[PDB]
UniProtKB/Swiss-Prot annotation:
This is Bifunctional cytochrome P450/NADPH--P450 reductase. It is found in: Cytoplasm. (9Z)-hexadecenoate binds at Y48. Induction: By pentobarbital. Expression is negatively regulated by repressor bm3R1 at the transcriptional level. The chain holds residues 5 to 456 of 1049 of the full protein. The lineage of its organism: Bacteria, Bacillati, Bacillota, Bacilli, Bacillales. Heme binds at C396. It comes from the Bacteria. Changing A79W: 800-fold binding affinity for laurate as substrate. Low coupling of NADPH consumption to laurate formation. Very much more effective in indole hydroxylation. Favors omega-1 hydroxylation. It comes from Priestia megaterium (strain ATCC 14581 / DSM 32 / CCUG 1817 / JCM 2506 / NBRC 15308 / NCIMB 9376 / NCTC 10342 / NRRL B-14308 / VKM B-512 / Ford 19). Residues 1-451 are annotated as: Cytochrome P450. Changing A325V: Substrate binding affinity increases 5-10 fold and the turnover number increases 2-8-fold for palmitate as substrate compared to the wild-type. In the N-terminal section; belongs to the cytochrome P450 family. Disulfide bonds: none annotated.
Length: 451
């Protein structure tokens, strides 16, 4: 019989996720129950997988396909049939996947690099301009970086996050829609009048996002400009299979999807990376030495960012410990037995990435230690042991983008500043649909290296 955490009568396990930190709650359950536990909610059953042994099987795409978790299903209300919230069998998935893959390749990063540098330099400049008495709100600034980077590379839009403390109206709505999607996970009687105004606000936020993104698309189509951004690629792309381009609605969903992905999901990586760097000065020194040796020019080149191997290891080790897209869902395409012990019927598994990444049978007993050297040789990483970007054809299309922007800015941060964990910050991971070291603050003392 499969382990299952404590239940709450008719609510089954659902109230276990009625907590500020559900991923961490699930990790704790995984620690207690092991590599697989059943999680039941009213009208839902899933099985949380935490071991590489089981997850490797779940990642067999011949047996399991991506499932929309309840979170993804609720985000689908505004991310539509964008790539993240589409089922693999939906026409728009493969179509957009085929169209967008070349826009997200490592080679495509060469084209986004200058725009990424634009924002990265703004980040560096912000911190260069802080007064000595001041500190950095790390996740906030990382989000400024990542949001602005995806805005610029996504559709040549400047969110200008370094010019405001208040979020862009689209982001206000996106964050509130994501929050409402996450809140609806715990909503008994959704059509109750208590959650009534949440619905009105949710629809208003969906409309804000649609109107703003639709206007972006329409403005680009009307202007005819051919930027080297994702929007241009989507407006001009043709899926070789169907022969079809994405329609404007799906492009809007893709843009919404990229903005969600490139917001705190991506900035969390940077925030956790910097968190671990300041908590592990030996690592920081090693990463800083690489940044200093490699980033010999006032602005990093693409080729230099590629040489930031140890920065990449830092990022991978941050992704190991706190993958900011911490779970993905799969479903059994047919009846199948998982791991020789768990018969599954056709039709859900949750891959609990932080737990996979703590599988001592893969990583050794020191799984909680931040040791980028674990990633010194990518050959040492067994298949499916490390899956911060998900799996297979449903893996993160933005992986190279996220890692390039993260490596670039982290490299620049490490080149340009020494960092002080001046509050001896106690890791407190705030959960939305992503993870963030909430309140993580540092001081950055400029090395006074010009840009
Ligand atoms: C550190 C940053 C990121 C992490 C950890 C991450 C993680 C993931 C994961 C785990 C998935 C699979 C989700 C699932 O199976 O349900 C995914 C999918 C996806 N991600 Fe990311 N992501 C990141 C950044 C980005 C960025 C910056 C973009 C685009 C601008 C992006 C776009 C996507 C898309 C479009 C998909 C769906 C791909 C498909 O199913 O065809 N992600 N991401
Ligand atoms: O699975 C996802 C959401 C997946 C989204 C990650 N993602 C995908 C693409 N980009 C990011 N949360 C986990 C944990 C959870 C549970 C309740 C409330 C919040 C979070 C789960 O549902 O058990
Ligand atoms: C677009 C990334 C995403 C989508 C839904 C939920 C969380 C994260």
């Amino acid at each position: 019989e499969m382990p299952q955490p404590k239940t709450f009568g008719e609510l089954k396990n659902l109230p276990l996720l009625n907590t500020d930190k559900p991923v961490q709650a699930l990790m704790k359950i995984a620690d207690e129950l092991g590599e697989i536990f059943k999680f039941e909610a009213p009208g839902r059953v899933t099985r949380y997988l935490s071991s590489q042994r089981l997850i490797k099987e779940a990642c067999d795409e011949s047996r399991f396909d991506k499932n929309l978790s309840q979170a993804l299903k609720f985000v689908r209300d505004f991310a539509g049939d964008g790539l993240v919230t589409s089922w693999t069998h939906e026409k728009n998935w493969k179509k957009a996947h085929n169209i967008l893959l070349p826009s997200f390749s490592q080679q495509a990063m060469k084209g986004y690099h200058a725009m990424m540098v634009d924002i990265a330099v703004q980040l560096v400049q912000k911190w260069e301009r802080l007064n000595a008495d001041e500190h950095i709100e790390v996740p906030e600034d990382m989000t400024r970086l990542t949001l602005d980077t995806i805005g610029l590379c996504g559709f040549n839009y400047r969110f200008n996050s370094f010019y405001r403390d208040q979020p862009h109206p689209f982001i206000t709505s996106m964050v509130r829609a994501l929050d409402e999607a996450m809140n609806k996970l715990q909503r008994a009687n959704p059509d109750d009048p208590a959650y009534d105004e949440n619905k009105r606000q949710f629809q208003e936020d969906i409309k804000v996002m649609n109107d703003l993104v639709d206007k972006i698309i329409a403005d680009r189509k009307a202007s005819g400009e051919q930027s080297d951004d994702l929007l241009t690629h989507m407006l001009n792309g043709k899926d070789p299979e169907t022969g079809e381009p994405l329609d404007d609605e799906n492009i809007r969903y893709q843009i919404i999807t990229f903005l969600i992905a490139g917001h705190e999901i991506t900035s969390g990586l940077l925030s956790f990376a910097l968190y671990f760097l300041v908590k592990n000065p030996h690592v920081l020194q090693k990463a800083a030495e690489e940044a200093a040796r490699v980033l010999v020019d006032p602005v990093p080149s693409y080729k230099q960012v590629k040489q930031l191997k140890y920065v990449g290891m830092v990022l991978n080790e941050a992704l190991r410990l706190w993958p900011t897209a911490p779970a993905f869902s799969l479903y059994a395409k047919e009846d199948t037995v998982l791991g020789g012990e768990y018969p599954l019927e056709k039709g859900e598994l949750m891959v609990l990435i932080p737990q996979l990444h703590r599988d001592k049978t893969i990583w050794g007993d020191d799984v909680e230690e931040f040791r980028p050297e674990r990633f010194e040789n990518p050959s040492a990483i067994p298949q499916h042991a490390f899956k911060p970007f998900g799996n297979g054809q449903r893996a993160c299309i933005g992986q190279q983008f996220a890692l390039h922007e993260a490596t670039l800015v982290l490299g620049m941060m490490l080149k340009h500043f020494d960092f002080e964990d001046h509050t001896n910050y106690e890791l407190d991971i705030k959960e939305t649909l992503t993870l963030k070291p909430e309140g993580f603050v540092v001081k950055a003392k400029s090395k006074k290296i010009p840009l």
